[PDB]
Amino acid sequence: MIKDKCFEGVRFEQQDLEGEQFQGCRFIGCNFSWLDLAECRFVDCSFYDRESEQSCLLQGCDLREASFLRCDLTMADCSRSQCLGLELRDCQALGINFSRASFANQITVKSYFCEAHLTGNNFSYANFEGCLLEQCELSGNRWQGANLFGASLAGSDLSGSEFGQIDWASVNLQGCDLRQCDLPGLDLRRVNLDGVQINEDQQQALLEQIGLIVFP
Amino acid sequence: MIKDKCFEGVRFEQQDLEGEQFQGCRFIGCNFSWLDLAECRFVDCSFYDRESEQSCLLQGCDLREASFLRCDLTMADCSRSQCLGLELRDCQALGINFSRASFANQITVKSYFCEAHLTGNNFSYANFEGCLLEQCELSGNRWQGANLFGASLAGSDLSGSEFGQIDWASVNLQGCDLRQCDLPGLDLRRVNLDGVQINEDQQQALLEQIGLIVFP
């Protein structure tokens, strides 16, 4: 357990953080890249220095079944990380980069077990370009300005997310739970929504988008 | 007023029915073709013999502002007829033929005044191929197996209609009131529904058609 410690400009080695739990820690411009962070736990930790805008590097990290809870991961570089079983909950993640990060197994074996759990996060202006976020728990996130181009969210729970005006046509939504989501500009004629779950109060916006006039 | 009269195999001339009103009359294999029936009025009349299956011919008739109320117009040939202002209310009209009949004017000056009133009729297996049924009152009709190929119902009121499974993509439905209609097999990815009016309770069936799962 590493508690209430400040690390500045530190390039972490594997033995520094092997199986370690971090609580209340601050990482300023630290480099964790290509380390095995599997099953690590970070709670109430900051990885972004607000005054200097320094971010941390976690490129190519094994993040499998790692857990981040209420952390500031603003501008964190998680590109090329292994993220199967990653848990990110209630984290500030503005601009987080997951380009080339693997989440779901290409051999998706359909069940009610989630392949990852990213809930309650701010993912505004994040980069999930090309990512396979299939059969994941992804509810309660904010996604405004996020790059989801060529990504797949197939089979995922997105309920209660705030998307803003996403390029809906470039992301696979098949089988998603989109209940209690704003879906502005989503066009049924242009976007495949097979297996998609919505509430009855979401119907009217979708149908009006294609020119229907809905009455009580 | 001509009342309770039977006409067998009569080829009608203009003098016979000029500005005339018919009640409770029977017409068995009669020819009205090419006559001016404008503003003529038929109430509780039969134009179809149910044993012999003899129908009447009304090809190229002026039917402008004519009215047929509770008439049996089964298999009537009304092709090439003029029909601006025609009123058919509550008629049995299985297999009626309106091909090449003119309803709405192409000089379609948009208002809340209907070009024609056809309500409460059985139009099952009718032929309205090519017809301009635009800005018309067309409610409460049954249309099962009707040919609506190349027709326009644009701007018309079809509410309370029973359609069965019509070739939805070959008929113009823009601006139509489709409230209280069962709309089976209507696919919003393939059918322009711009300006169409539906009730809230019709949304689920349209959405389910394209793969969505609607919950309370």
Side-chain angles (χ1 to χ4, degrees), chain A residues 1-105 107-216, chain B residues 1-105 107-216:
Chain A
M1 176 62 91
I2 302 189
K3 203 210 198 320
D4 294 347
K5 269 188 81 75
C6 181
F7 296 90
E8 41 184 71
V10 168
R11 156 78 247 196
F12 285 98
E13 295 304 313
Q14 184 61 42
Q15 71 273 12
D16 287 321
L17 52 77
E18 185 73 40
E20 270 299 340
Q21 193 151 27
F22 295 88
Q23 179 166 63
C25 291
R26 187 187 301 277
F27 309 100
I28 303 168
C30 293
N31 192 349
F32 304 85
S33 306
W34 306 99
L35 290 173
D36 180 0
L37 274 61
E39 291 156 347
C40 283
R41 271 191 70 103
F42 305 85
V43 173
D44 297 314
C45 292
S46 169
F47 295 83
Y48 175 77
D49 182 66
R50 295 168 57 77
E51 184 271 305
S52 67
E53 306 185 352
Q54 287 176 93
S55 58
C56 288
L57 311 180
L58 300 88
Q59 188 170 136
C61 282
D62 193 347
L63 296 181
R64 287 174 295 181
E65 296 177 351
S67 168
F68 292 82
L69 175 55
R70 297 189 302 281
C71 293
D72 185 353
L73 285 152
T74 299
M75 296 292 289
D77 176 4
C78 298
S79 54
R80 313 170 189 267
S81 61
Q82 299 170 78
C83 293
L84 176 67
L86 176 60
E87 170 178 44
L88 247 64
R89 292 190 195 280
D90 309 325
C91 290
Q92 173 58 267
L94 176 73
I96 194 166
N97 182 5
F98 281 105
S99 158
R100 295 207 176 86
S102 58
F103 288 90
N105 275 336
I107 32 180
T108 199
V109 42
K110 197 213 173 75
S111 70
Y112 297 97
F113 303 126
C114 309
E115 204 79 323
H117 300 271
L118 321 188
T119 63
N121 307 293
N122 180 14
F123 285 141
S124 292
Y125 302 102
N127 181 10
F128 286 99
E129 178 168 359
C131 294
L132 188 91
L133 293 151
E134 292 192 325
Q135 196 168 295
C136 292
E137 186 186 39
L138 306 165
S139 60
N141 297 299
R142 182 164 167 107
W143 304 87
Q144 284 260 0
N147 174 0
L148 280 160
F149 193 74
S152 174
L153 299 169
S156 293
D157 179 4
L158 276 157
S159 54
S161 287
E162 186 177 332
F163 288 110
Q165 292 183 355
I166 293 291
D167 174 5
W168 295 111
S170 309
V171 52
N172 179 358
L173 292 165
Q174 287 171 70
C176 288
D177 189 356
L178 299 182
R179 283 178 285 183
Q180 307 280 351
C181 290
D182 67 333
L183 297 175
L186 182 45
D187 192 315
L188 314 175
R189 305 167 288 181
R190 304 219 163 184
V191 181
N192 184 340
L193 298 165
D194 195 57
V196 165
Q197 309 146 82
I198 66 182
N199 297 307
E200 67 194 339
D201 71 354
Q202 281 172 297
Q203 300 184 106
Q204 175 164 345
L206 294 163
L207 287 167
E208 284 174 353
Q209 190 75 59
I210 71 169
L212 280 161
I213 301 164
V214 180
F215 294 76
Chain B
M1 178 66 89
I2 311 296
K3 182 160 182 291
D4 298 340
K5 304 229 135 301
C6 181
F7 296 94
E8 207 287 286
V10 179
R11 202 303 169 214
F12 288 107
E13 298 173 27
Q14 190 67 39
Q15 194 166 283
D16 298 337
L17 57 260
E18 176 65 36
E20 190 66 69
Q21 179 159 10
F22 294 89
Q23 186 181 112
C25 289
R26 186 185 308 272
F27 307 93
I28 304 180
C30 293
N31 195 345
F32 300 83
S33 305
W34 310 105
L35 292 178
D36 179 5
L37 277 55
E39 309 182 75
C40 282
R41 185 148 155 77
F42 305 82
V43 169
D44 299 313
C45 293
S46 176
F47 299 78
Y48 176 75
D49 189 65
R50 296 165 57 78
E51 177 202 47
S52 56
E53 308 191 351
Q54 294 180 76
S55 49
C56 287
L57 300 179
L58 302 86
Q59 293 165 6
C61 281
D62 194 343
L63 296 176
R64 288 182 281 182
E65 297 189 83
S67 283
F68 299 78
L69 173 53
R70 296 183 306 273
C71 290
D72 184 0
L73 280 162
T74 294
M75 295 295 287
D77 187 351
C78 291
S79 56
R80 297 140 100 189
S81 64
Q82 302 170 73
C83 295
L84 189 61
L86 180 68
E87 172 187 21
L88 293 208
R89 309 273 189 191
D90 305 319
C91 290
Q92 179 62 247
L94 172 83
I96 194 154
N97 187 5
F98 277 111
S99 71
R100 299 191 274 147
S102 56
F103 294 86
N105 274 348
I107 318 193
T108 190
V109 53
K110 178 162 91 168
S111 70
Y112 294 95
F113 301 135
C114 307
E115 297 281 77
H117 300 266
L118 315 184
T119 59
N121 309 286
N122 189 17
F123 288 148
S124 297
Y125 303 101
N127 182 7
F128 291 94
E129 179 163 356
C131 294
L132 197 65
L133 294 147
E134 291 187 328
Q135 195 170 287
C136 282
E137 182 176 55
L138 303 178
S139 62
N141 297 292
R142 178 172 137 96
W143 307 88
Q144 181 87 41
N147 175 5
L148 281 165
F149 183 92
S152 173
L153 312 171
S156 297
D157 177 2
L158 277 293
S159 53
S161 280
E162 168 175 25
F163 278 111
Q165 200 139 9
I166 260 171
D167 184 8
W168 296 112
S170 307
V171 54
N172 188 350
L173 296 165
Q174 286 175 256
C176 289
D177 189 353
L178 295 187
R179 285 182 287 193
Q180 312 282 336
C181 295
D182 265 325
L183 293 166
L186 192 172
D187 186 329
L188 61 83
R189 301 167 297 185
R190 297 196 154 155
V191 182
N192 190 339
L193 294 182
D194 194 35
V196 164
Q197 305 115 60
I198 60 177
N199 299 119
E200 282 198 287
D201 72 358
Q202 287 174 285
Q203 302 181 103
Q204 174 170 0
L206 290 162
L207 288 176
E208 282 176 340
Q209 190 79 46
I210 65 153
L212 278 123
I213 306 174
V214 179
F215 290 73

